[PDB]
Design a protein around this ligand. Sequence first.
Ligand SMILES: *[C@@H]1O[C@H](CO)[C@@H](O[C@@H]2O[C@H](CO)[C@@H](O[C@@H]3O[C@H](CO[C@H]4O[C@H](CO)[C@@H](O)[C@H](O)[C@@H]4O)[C@@H](O)[C@H](O[C@H]4O[C@H](CO)[C@@H](O)[C@H](O)[C@@H]4O)[C@@H]3O)[C@H](O)[C@H]2NC(C)=O)[C@H](O)[C@H]1NC(C)=O
Ligand SMILES: *[C@@H]1O[C@H](CO)[C@@H](O[C@@H]2O[C@H](CO)[C@@H](O)[C@H](O)[C@H]2NC(C)=O)[C@H](O)[C@H]1NC(C)=O
Ligand SMILES: *[C@@H]1O[C@H](CO)[C@@H](O[C@@H]2O[C@H](CO)[C@@H](O)[C@H](O)[C@H]2NC(C)=O)[C@H](O)[C@H]1NC(C)=O
Ligand SMILES: [Zn+2]
Ligand SMILES: [Zn+2]
Ligand SMILES: [Zn+2]
Length: 256
Amino acid sequence: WGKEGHEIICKIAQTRLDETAAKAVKELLPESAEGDLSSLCLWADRVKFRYHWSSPLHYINTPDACSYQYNRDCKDESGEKGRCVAGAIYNYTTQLLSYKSQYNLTEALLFVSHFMGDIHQPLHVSYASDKGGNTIEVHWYTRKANLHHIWDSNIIETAEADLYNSALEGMVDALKKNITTEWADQVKRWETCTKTACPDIYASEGIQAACDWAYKGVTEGDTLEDEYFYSRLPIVYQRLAQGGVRLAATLNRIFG
Ligand SMILES: *[C@@H]1O[C@H](CO)[C@@H](O[C@@H]2O[C@H](CO)[C@@H](O[C@@H]3O[C@H](CO[C@H]4O[C@H](CO)[C@@H](O)[C@H](O)[C@@H]4O)[C@@H](O)[C@H](O[C@H]4O[C@H](CO)[C@@H](O)[C@H](O)[C@@H]4O)[C@@H]3O)[C@H](O)[C@H]2NC(C)=O)[C@H](O)[C@H]1NC(C)=O
Ligand SMILES: *[C@@H]1O[C@H](CO)[C@@H](O[C@@H]2O[C@H](CO)[C@@H](O)[C@H](O)[C@H]2NC(C)=O)[C@H](O)[C@H]1NC(C)=O
Ligand SMILES: *[C@@H]1O[C@H](CO)[C@@H](O[C@@H]2O[C@H](CO)[C@@H](O)[C@H](O)[C@H]2NC(C)=O)[C@H](O)[C@H]1NC(C)=O
Ligand SMILES: [Zn+2]
Ligand SMILES: [Zn+2]
Ligand SMILES: [Zn+2]
């Protein structure tokens, strides 16, 4: 996701942390953050070339099909296994199990926070043939955009201005509201994991949603407007709340 999506995810996550996780996160966050996880949840997007080895870790590429398998899909352009957003979540959550060696646990926190968000972007788990939709040029109303960008940013941004009078906390408060009184049963399931993180579950969901909702109906050159916006906004919200809930659930498990 772009900036809004990651904020929303990390804000939600942070208000769902139990006391020990809440403590850990403050201790790992720099003073410049001022205790706010969401201030640094885009940090990973700023180090793709600083740490060139990190850039495959933001997504998963699948063949032209609506499935994800770890052993098949989790790998970078060198074919190196586990070099994908799923493998990264396993790596960085494992490191945070060490919190009380070789690893910067402030980075692991910032990577895990970001990647938990990214694994929930449907187009961060989608076709390598169109690079997760980046090569599908459409218009977002009057502006040229690619399909990937529409899911990273445009949909959230449009809802932000059109249904929440330019206040993001408007939308955060509404996702939070639906977490406790519409989605309560779903949320319990979203939080369940029998490992420390359950990334392949989230990836499988994402590829399903890329196909059912993101790619669906869309042809190169289309103008996506109200109809697409309104029918796809519910899955965007779904995926933000899920990221939010699973990020918190994961840090609670790790630090507990
Ligand atoms: C799990 O999380 C960790 C922590 O973030 C990640 O660890 C990094 O992994 C990358 C590679 O995937 C490492 O980058 C490589 O570093 C090599 C030398 O590193 C030295 O320097 C570092 C810090 O300066 C020290 O750890 C130590 O002194 C090392 O000796 C370079 O030689 C590599 O570059 C060469 O190979 C690459 C291919 O990887 C080529 O592209 C280049 O052209 C070049 O020839 C490379 O840069 C990085 O240093 C690791 N850091 C640490 C702290 O361990 C894991 O990647 C991550 N895994 C996941 C998410 O799956
Ligand atoms: C652990 O990693 C973090 C982030 O990479 C380091 O914090 C950064 O330090 C650099 C270099 O001095 C600064 O320029 C940045 O402003 C800092 N960023 C953040 C987000 O805090 C931290 O110093 C590292 N810990 C080490 C090396 O022990
Ligand atoms: C929170 O959940 C509510 C209710 O399930 C969603 O509101 C419904 O959604 C449609 C748009 O898809 C509206 O036209 C209906 O009028 C709504 N019903 C009610 C009772 O309000 C709402 O959009 C969800 N909000 C978020 C942020 O997820
Ligand atoms: Zn993102
Ligand atoms: Zn993206
Ligand atoms: Zn990213």
